[PDB]
């Protein structure tokens, strides 16, 4: 209960938690993104790397 | 001797974009015809 | 006024015999009118344009 | 600047006209004014609350209707 | 241009409001 | 609300991320948000009034048009108020009345 | 010409449905109830969200609904209908459009304007879908876009019928006028008592001014510091903003009563005395609408012109854009942002105030001729009524009205402008023009009550 009480002239405990969660969680999603491309791609078909 | 599908690569902008995309970190200077 | 016009109008009325019950009964600033038109039309057109601009 | 001086004469006269119109028009009396004030106040509150409640109810419904 | 009684207009209005709620719920179920 | 000072609406997240506002406090019966509590309370009052207006409608010496109109309002308030309340709880507790 | 059009449109006009005539007069309990049902159904519809709203960040349109009205079913609302009405009136005043005096011709004219409003709604909806404001048209799909357009179109059509029913006499007054008043009053109450708490970077605060005062007082040990914040908090609705609003109402009520009444009598029957009233705000809110429209129209052209031709000296001279015009004539037209700024640049403040009053007064007088409410039109209307002034010949009556009608219109334009300027500086919630509509509509309903009590 206390972790969500509106705090005037202060930052709510819940809010800070959410914030960092976004940073860490968002980055983790990027790892899935990278693997998705590598596997789901066709490299040589889209061989702009030439 | 590029293929017909590779005409886009022949474009001056396209080659420069590829150099920035992949070869930007090459130590030696890279020159593109202009 | 020339008296000659008395006879002139008399013959005209004589013609009415053929034009029965069909005789012709008779015989706003310009700048302001234009000014209002763009104001009312402009508001509608501009409101549409502004909505697209605000989204864009 | 000639037009501005010419305008001054119309400027004064219609100002005189306004004063005459004020004198002729009926002026609401204090006692009747109180009656209007209560009537408007009651209508304002009664009508306004209907908007207030309907808006409040909708907000939870919005969550359910769309995630 | 048909002349319509006031009460018929009320019922038609309500049906339209009901339909919109049905469409939203149908949208979630069809997605799910 | 005064003692616990909960927010009007909270926030949630998903794999797509981003902060959903929340109106209903899920899975705890003794916790609520400001908006949710007032919305539920209004329904309870409305249901009670619907009966009283229906009772007044039954009085004699009322016109045909007045009597029909009053009855329609009475049933609408009673039925919507009761039915809606069940939906609100069903969302708050997913297993409500489920067996 | 226009009559020739009317016959051409006549097959189109027939399709539009019309409300039934009330067979007999409705008693008061019934009289009130019909309006109330109309009010609730419209009010609920205004907040219903749309379907297939799509949206990068999902749940964007979710957060949008809980704040403003953007994205709701009634977003088009009354704006299409009113535009149709105003344009039709202007054409008649121009005389480019000709309306037959006979009842059948006038009925066709009413049918035409209703149809014209319908056309406006379709065009406005189509533009929004094309602009992709909701989302990319390709992403939505052909089926979704068509359905969304259908939803708005029916929303406009239903509004027309509800307004017509109020005019027909089932419910007192006109539906559209009541609807506009309803939201304005709703805004005042919502700001005062809204419990939603919005998180500012420093801290979360309650939207409601009264709610904010109570919460702030308890939380803070120092009462004096809390009290000052509640009264003069700039970010959120102030306590002072409400007190200004109440003061503005008092002024509007007192002035609204002002009118001049001219003795009139029926020629046919002796002993019958009636007075024809000319109100002080004879023009009504129309002048302010025109003046604001012109300023907005000029602003849009000036800002757009700057982008296309930044180099041109002329575009900069009229206005320099930073969008707010920092300098130039358009900057002078802009209202002063703050009282402190006005002190900083008195010449700018004086120019804006003088222009604001002058523009309204001039527009009101010119509007009368195109409006059709001129003294010449008034006299002819009385003749059909068969009611004439007492003690004067018919021709003389026109001169007698001309004594009062022109002066009233000019003064009314000045007065309406004066209130509008006054409202912003005080900071009272809501536009001054809105305040007049609320009091006027409420008072008309009150007058109807008086006969009923008998």
mmCIF file of C-alpha atoms in Angstrom, chain G residues 229-372:
data_model
loop_
_atom_site.group_PDB
_atom_site.id
_atom_site.type_symbol
_atom_site.label_atom_id
_atom_site.label_comp_id
_atom_site.label_asym_id
_atom_site.label_seq_id
_atom_site.Cartn_x
_atom_site.Cartn_y
_atom_site.Cartn_z
ATOM 1 C CA UNK G 229 -0.361 28.308 -3.602
ATOM 2 C CA UNK G 230 -4.020 27.319 -3.862
ATOM 3 C CA UNK G 231 -5.208 30.817 -4.783
ATOM 4 C CA UNK G 232 -2.450 31.636 -7.286
ATOM 5 C CA UNK G 233 -1.168 28.305 -8.612
ATOM 6 C CA UNK G 234 -0.545 28.992 -12.292
ATOM 7 C CA UNK G 235 -0.114 25.417 -13.497
ATOM 8 C CA UNK G 236 -3.529 24.167 -12.359
ATOM 9 C CA UNK G 237 -6.972 25.776 -12.058
ATOM 10 C CA UNK G 238 -6.825 28.440 -9.375
ATOM 11 C CA UNK G 239 -9.251 29.261 -6.621
ATOM 12 C CA UNK G 240 -9.260 32.812 -7.979
ATOM 13 C CA UNK G 241 -10.325 31.588 -11.418
ATOM 14 C CA UNK G 242 -13.636 30.463 -9.935
ATOM 15 C CA UNK G 243 -14.211 33.707 -8.039
ATOM 16 C CA UNK G 244 -13.659 35.635 -11.256
ATOM 17 C CA UNK G 245 -16.244 33.425 -12.955
ATOM 18 C CA UNK G 246 -18.910 34.125 -10.340
ATOM 19 C CA UNK G 247 -18.290 37.850 -10.655
ATOM 20 C CA UNK G 248 -18.675 37.690 -14.430
ATOM 21 C CA UNK G 249 -22.061 36.002 -14.100
ATOM 22 C CA UNK G 250 -23.382 38.852 -11.979
ATOM 23 C CA UNK G 251 -22.492 41.416 -14.629
ATOM 24 C CA UNK G 252 -24.007 39.381 -17.465
ATOM 25 C CA UNK G 253 -27.338 39.008 -15.668
ATOM 26 C CA UNK G 254 -27.685 42.721 -14.985
ATOM 27 C CA UNK G 255 -26.869 43.820 -18.526
ATOM 28 C CA UNK G 256 -28.865 41.067 -20.216
ATOM 29 C CA UNK G 257 -32.115 42.535 -18.913
ATOM 30 C CA UNK G 258 -31.535 45.784 -20.793
ATOM 31 C CA UNK G 259 -34.015 46.308 -23.625
ATOM 32 C CA UNK G 260 -36.229 48.950 -25.216
ATOM 33 C CA UNK G 261 -39.919 48.174 -25.717
ATOM 34 C CA UNK G 262 -42.118 49.935 -28.261
ATOM 35 C CA UNK G 263 -45.916 50.076 -27.855
ATOM 36 C CA UNK G 264 -47.780 48.036 -30.461
ATOM 37 C CA UNK G 265 -51.440 47.200 -31.010
ATOM 38 C CA UNK G 266 -53.464 44.834 -33.162
ATOM 39 C CA UNK G 267 -55.408 46.669 -35.858
ATOM 40 C CA UNK G 268 -58.256 44.147 -35.945
ATOM 41 C CA UNK G 269 -59.173 44.183 -32.248
ATOM 42 C CA UNK G 270 -59.417 47.054 -29.786
ATOM 43 C CA UNK G 271 -58.054 47.002 -26.260
ATOM 44 C CA UNK G 272 -55.191 44.605 -27.025
ATOM 45 C CA UNK G 273 -51.817 45.964 -25.940
ATOM 46 C CA UNK G 274 -48.526 44.285 -26.767
ATOM 47 C CA UNK G 275 -44.955 45.564 -26.783
ATOM 48 C CA UNK G 276 -42.267 44.656 -29.279
ATOM 49 C CA UNK G 277 -38.904 44.318 -27.508
ATOM 50 C CA UNK G 278 -35.506 45.177 -28.967
ATOM 51 C CA UNK G 279 -32.742 43.793 -26.773
ATOM 52 C CA UNK G 280 -29.552 45.661 -25.968
ATOM 53 C CA UNK G 281 -27.546 42.675 -27.212
ATOM 54 C CA UNK G 282 -29.708 42.744 -30.309
ATOM 55 C CA UNK G 283 -27.037 41.252 -32.558
ATOM 56 C CA UNK G 284 -26.240 38.499 -30.010
ATOM 57 C CA UNK G 285 -22.932 36.612 -30.145
ATOM 58 C CA UNK G 286 -22.632 36.831 -33.945
ATOM 59 C CA UNK G 287 -20.210 39.811 -34.033
ATOM 60 C CA UNK G 288 -17.582 38.167 -31.833
ATOM 61 C CA UNK G 289 -17.796 35.019 -33.942
ATOM 62 C CA UNK G 290 -16.995 36.981 -37.094
ATOM 63 C CA UNK G 291 -14.158 38.984 -35.551
ATOM 64 C CA UNK G 292 -12.446 35.930 -34.070
ATOM 65 C CA UNK G 293 -12.884 34.071 -37.345
ATOM 66 C CA UNK G 294 -11.150 36.844 -39.271
ATOM 67 C CA UNK G 295 -8.190 36.964 -36.881
ATOM 68 C CA UNK G 296 -7.727 33.193 -37.015
ATOM 69 C CA UNK G 297 -8.048 33.227 -40.800
ATOM 70 C CA UNK G 298 -5.404 35.939 -41.089
ATOM 71 C CA UNK G 299 -3.089 34.088 -38.706
ATOM 72 C CA UNK G 300 -3.270 30.854 -40.698
ATOM 73 C CA UNK G 301 -2.545 32.620 -43.984
ATOM 74 C CA UNK G 302 0.290 34.674 -42.503
ATOM 75 C CA UNK G 303 2.087 31.714 -40.916
ATOM 76 C CA UNK G 304 1.643 29.553 -44.014
ATOM 77 C CA UNK G 305 2.866 32.358 -46.280
ATOM 78 C CA UNK G 306 6.041 32.734 -44.223
ATOM 79 C CA UNK G 307 7.017 29.103 -44.806
ATOM 80 C CA UNK G 308 6.448 29.194 -48.567
ATOM 81 C CA UNK G 309 8.191 32.578 -49.034
ATOM 82 C CA UNK G 310 10.320 33.331 -45.985
ATOM 83 C CA UNK G 311 12.402 35.769 -48.021
ATOM 84 C CA UNK G 312 9.552 38.081 -48.978
ATOM 85 C CA UNK G 313 9.602 41.293 -46.961
ATOM 86 C CA UNK G 314 5.821 41.698 -47.049
ATOM 87 C CA UNK G 315 5.101 38.490 -45.131
ATOM 88 C CA UNK G 316 7.507 39.456 -42.346
ATOM 89 C CA UNK G 317 6.138 43.005 -42.176
ATOM 90 C CA UNK G 318 2.567 41.925 -41.438
ATOM 91 C CA UNK G 319 3.757 39.212 -39.065
ATOM 92 C CA UNK G 320 6.986 37.674 -37.785
ATOM 93 C CA UNK G 321 6.547 34.103 -36.551
ATOM 94 C CA UNK G 322 8.548 32.508 -33.742
ATOM 95 C CA UNK G 323 3.431 29.688 -33.384
ATOM 96 C CA UNK G 324 3.146 33.184 -31.926
ATOM 97 C CA UNK G 325 3.831 36.357 -33.950
ATOM 98 C CA UNK G 326 6.494 38.233 -32.006
ATOM 99 C CA UNK G 327 6.198 41.374 -34.124
ATOM 100 C CA UNK G 328 4.108 43.047 -36.786
ATOM 101 C CA UNK G 329 0.438 43.793 -37.229
ATOM 102 C CA UNK G 330 -0.526 40.191 -36.476
ATOM 103 C CA UNK G 331 1.440 40.465 -33.239
ATOM 104 C CA UNK G 332 -0.585 43.568 -32.388
ATOM 105 C CA UNK G 333 -3.779 41.621 -33.076
ATOM 106 C CA UNK G 334 -2.679 38.897 -30.667
ATOM 107 C CA UNK G 335 -4.034 39.356 -27.127
ATOM 108 C CA UNK G 336 -1.456 40.309 -24.488
ATOM 109 C CA UNK G 337 -0.228 37.151 -22.797
ATOM 110 C CA UNK G 338 0.037 38.521 -19.245
ATOM 111 C CA UNK G 339 -0.644 41.631 -17.197
ATOM 112 C CA UNK G 340 3.098 42.088 -16.692
ATOM 113 C CA UNK G 341 3.709 41.996 -20.436
ATOM 114 C CA UNK G 342 1.040 44.667 -20.917
ATOM 115 C CA UNK G 343 2.913 46.958 -18.538
ATOM 116 C CA UNK G 344 6.128 46.193 -20.424
ATOM 117 C CA UNK G 345 4.670 47.243 -23.811
ATOM 118 C CA UNK G 346 1.712 49.566 -23.189
ATOM 119 C CA UNK G 347 1.467 50.606 -26.840
ATOM 120 C CA UNK G 348 0.884 46.994 -27.857
ATOM 121 C CA UNK G 349 -1.851 46.561 -25.251
ATOM 122 C CA UNK G 350 -3.648 49.768 -26.221
ATOM 123 C CA UNK G 351 -3.655 48.877 -29.911
ATOM 124 C CA UNK G 352 -5.180 45.458 -29.272
ATOM 125 C CA UNK G 353 -7.910 46.803 -26.993
ATOM 126 C CA UNK G 354 -8.885 49.622 -29.347
ATOM 127 C CA UNK G 355 -8.987 47.273 -32.325
ATOM 128 C CA UNK G 356 -11.038 44.672 -30.476
ATOM 129 C CA UNK G 357 -13.825 47.085 -29.585
ATOM 130 C CA UNK G 358 -13.898 48.735 -32.997
ATOM 131 C CA UNK G 359 -14.001 45.493 -34.960
ATOM 132 C CA UNK G 360 -17.024 44.150 -33.097
ATOM 133 C CA UNK G 361 -19.022 47.367 -33.404
ATOM 134 C CA UNK G 362 -18.443 47.721 -37.139
ATOM 135 C CA UNK G 363 -19.236 44.081 -37.878
ATOM 136 C CA UNK G 364 -22.520 44.203 -35.979
ATOM 137 C CA UNK G 365 -23.942 47.082 -38.011
ATOM 138 C CA UNK G 366 -22.920 45.563 -41.335
ATOM 139 C CA UNK G 367 -24.262 42.176 -40.273
ATOM 140 C CA UNK G 368 -27.795 43.521 -39.840
ATOM 141 C CA UNK G 369 -28.344 44.132 -43.547
ATOM 142 C CA UNK G 370 -27.273 40.636 -44.589
ATOM 143 C CA UNK G 371 -28.912 39.090 -41.521
ATOM 144 C CA UNK G 372 -32.355 40.287 -42.570
#
